[PDB]
Ligand binder design. Sequence first.
Ligand code: VMX
Ligand code: ZN
Lengths: 77, 301, 477
Amino acid sequence: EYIKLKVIGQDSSEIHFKVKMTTHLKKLKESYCQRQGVPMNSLRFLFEGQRIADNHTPKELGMEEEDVIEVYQEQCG
Amino acid sequence: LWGLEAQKRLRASRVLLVGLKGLGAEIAKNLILAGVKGLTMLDHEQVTPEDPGAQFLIRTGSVGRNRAEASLERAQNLNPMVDVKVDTEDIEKKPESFFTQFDAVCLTCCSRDVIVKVDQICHKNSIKFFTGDVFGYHGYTFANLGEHEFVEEKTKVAKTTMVKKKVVFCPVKEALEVDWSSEKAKAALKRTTSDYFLLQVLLKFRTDKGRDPSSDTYEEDSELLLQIRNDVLDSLGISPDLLPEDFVRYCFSEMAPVCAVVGGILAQEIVKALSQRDPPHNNFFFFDGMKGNGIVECLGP
Amino acid sequence: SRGLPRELAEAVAGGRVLVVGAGGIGCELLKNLVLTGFSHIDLIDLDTIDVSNLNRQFLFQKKHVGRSKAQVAKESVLQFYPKANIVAYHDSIMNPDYNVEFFRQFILVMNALDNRAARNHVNRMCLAADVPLIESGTAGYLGQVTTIKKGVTECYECHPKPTQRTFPGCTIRNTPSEPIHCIVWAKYLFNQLFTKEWAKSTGYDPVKLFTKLFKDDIRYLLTMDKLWRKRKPPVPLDWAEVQSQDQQVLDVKSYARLFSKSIETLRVHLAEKDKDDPSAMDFVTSAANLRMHIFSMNMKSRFDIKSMAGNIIPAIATTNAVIAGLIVLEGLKILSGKIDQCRTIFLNKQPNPRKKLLVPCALDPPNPNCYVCASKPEVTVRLNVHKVTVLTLQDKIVKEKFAMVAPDVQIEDGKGTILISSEEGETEANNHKKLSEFGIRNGSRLQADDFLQDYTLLINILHSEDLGKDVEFEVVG
Ligand SMILES: *NC[C@H](*)CS(=O)(=O)NC[C@H]1O[C@@H](n2cnc3c(N)ncnc32)[C@H](O)[C@@H]1O
Ligand SMILES: [Zn+2]
């Protein structure tokens, strides 16, 4: 089964992903990183306060339909 | 017509700030630098021996002088374009006519009863209401803007443009006197931070003792706070085990860093409200400087 | 100056702390420290003050314009607490004077910087000193605070930093380091025009305005050699000199003419009674590149400046207050011996689904692969050996990219031939010479030491004559 996930950045920005529940979340992270034009380990992705690792899946993390993934990015200013 | 109109709306606004201790100092400094049309600092109290330091707008050598009066020079010096004013009279005996000259009113150091009254006055006269206090490592802000309209730009959504939005706030009395016997409130209870109920405890202290808990009388205040903890939580249908005993040792006096944090958030909320540019935090902001939590709760409805 | 338990208060009153940077965050931090009971504070900042009611500073006012940031911050705070022992340095933290011995004086170091190269240096200095470092940053409503401790947490360089696409506007810059500081200055100058009001007196003369902020103002900055002793001095310009001798980077004469062209065009706009119109952007391109040339900085094209200028996030002073307050609160836990309670704290614009505006996060352990804080760190660089010289290696590959300050470089071969010497007057003649003349090519290894930073980096070389347009070196791994 597929699940649509909301990925919300610090600036209230929002991107929606539709991802296979058994597929590693590394794909979602590398896709989002490509959209922001930033390197792989440049941001952190949290779900329920837990850091989403490359080999994590929605099934393993009990992710529901329309659940929110939070993005955090270091400010150098 | 543009975000430039939000700029001129702020620069035409007059704010009333009550209470010129640590938190009020921070709020004044922030709002003045921002460029409000003017700010009126209201305090009835005089500078005490332990005030010139902790309050950076007060000069060393001002003990015995009115706290708001002694703040004026430093406060004005920050921005000559701001109309910085003082009021030495008591807020509790201030007529309703006085408030109508201000776009926003921000209360610090006031008793619950003064908080509710002034809030009720603002709503009657469409004035924007704010309150906030610091207690040790804890600090909070509350807003009541009633029917509030703002223009926030919404970032692109793909799988940026401006949009008008209306948010409805509620009176402080409803926000403070929440009924927890309801079915909706029971499920809300688990999600509600214990800092809300801590606020309830400290308000009762302030109303009864005429002051906040202090480092000088730690042991007596600490005993009364535990007594109030039971008398407030049990009188709400909530098991008094939500606030642990160790809460007493983290809510005394005014931590300068906490004023910095809570004064920074509150001031910005005042700015947002007056400019009508960004979505103001709906209702409460609770900060615990020991845990690094900044929570926005919506209570009252 | 008490508000917290005896052990902590005596720790705070007796300890000594370092604040690096005296801008928005710094000035707020300083106040927060003195009001908390920190009585021994060192404050360093290289820059001088430039302020106007276009953007207003906490401790900095019009009477302070042209003076040291750190000194004025010290003087301003001394008026609140007369008893604080504050040492102000008008200098760069990358001055070799501020060595490991200097850093061991402090029980806590707090960052308040706007650039990467300096942050990198402090990171390494703090690891070498074995001293807790509190790292902070801000942009608009957003910002974070974190804690770096050797052998416990990740260093400032354990993870790749997002390459800056959007630029946080900070408290007005006077001495340019990055090319963005000139674009901010030009954008700041543009909205300060369209002696403070010299244009309204000379009749918008593009030649008279040229000879004031690009002649006198910078010659006035040369009176103080506090920065100009080990760091590269700025070169003043005269209008009569410049006359004498699209993504295209142009020469100084053209930007001086476009400067006079922009002023000739924009004054027609002023006659009546924004950044989109070409003439407005033509000013920004000129006044910036002009300052860029003065401060030994490579000039940028219109295309690059256009997108950069559009990416400037406006400053929100209230956010810097929040962060400076969070820093001190993290400081208190460390000096309390409760580092295990420290958190990486992110600030949001709006509350998240979990109703959180401040988001605390567990501190991450050291990255075993980090090229800085790991034991025996090693990298790999691909470059053209027949084109790139030792000077290009030193100033743009060893010092710029890998952020070294006083490096010493020798070739790995069981001989140790000194290519680069930090000690002046040893390998000075090697600069112009090509790297291949020293027997360096594919497979060669370079052991670079920065004894100031107390840091060894092993550099692997892979040679390639093909790199592309405007490519000199490429980091691989
Ligand atoms: N992004 C947040 C705003 C940054 S700031 O608060 O304005 N601080 C900038 C301030 O720090 C100084 N700085 C930068 N690099 C420095 C070195 N190497 N040494 C000393 N100070 C240094 C700048 O001078 C700015 O004033
Ligand atoms: Zn590291």
